Design a protein around this ligand. Structure first.
Ligand SMILES: [Cl-]
Ligand code: NA
Lengths: 99, 102
């Protein structure tokens, strides 16, 4: 199916030992699908098969009692629904602002 | 409640803590956003706003940010944001009582 963008907000206490480990694992899982717009906010462009696989990984890595994941479904036309103002994102500043 | 023309904007404020200004700007931006929704991360905000409200809020946010040091990204979830947001796990620390989704 058509690729869509999911914006993933991972609310984790990263300065805590476990939180740091879980964030690293979640960041690694998300990395090649898009870009890291904050330390724990990820954009992932995914078709249906990719998203089913990815979502399962993320839910497995998080601690459901301590952390929370929020998914924002921007759809296939995410480009028409995202706006960037200001400095380039710290991560991959050479890439496009919008995926 | 909200009007039928209300929509959700998810605001990611990638703010620089290189100097004390960052925390100040974040405090101002958080305050501007607080009236319209909830704070889902330290610098990620949800705001439910109609067109006129958004025009005013957006202008305020752009004026408070430092455009050289910081970045603001706006994600326009539309009038049907409720069908496009999913929460898993613990309640948000800011406004832990309220609904998970506005
Ligand atoms: Cl922290
Ligand atoms: Na960390």
């Amino acid at each position: 199916n058509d690729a869509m963008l999911v914006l993933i907000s991972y609310d984790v206490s990263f300065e805590d030992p476990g939180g740091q480990r879980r964030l690293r694992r979640i960041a690694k899982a998300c990395q090649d699908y898009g870009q890291r717009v904050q330390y724990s906010v990820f954009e992932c462009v995914v078709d249906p098969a990719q998203w089913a696989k990815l979502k399962h990984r993320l839910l497995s890595e998080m601690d459901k009692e301590k952390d929370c994941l929020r998914f924002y479904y921007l759809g296939a036309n995410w480009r028409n629904k995202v706006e960037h103002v200001g400095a380039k994102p710290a991560y991959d500043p050479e890439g496009p602002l919008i995926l």
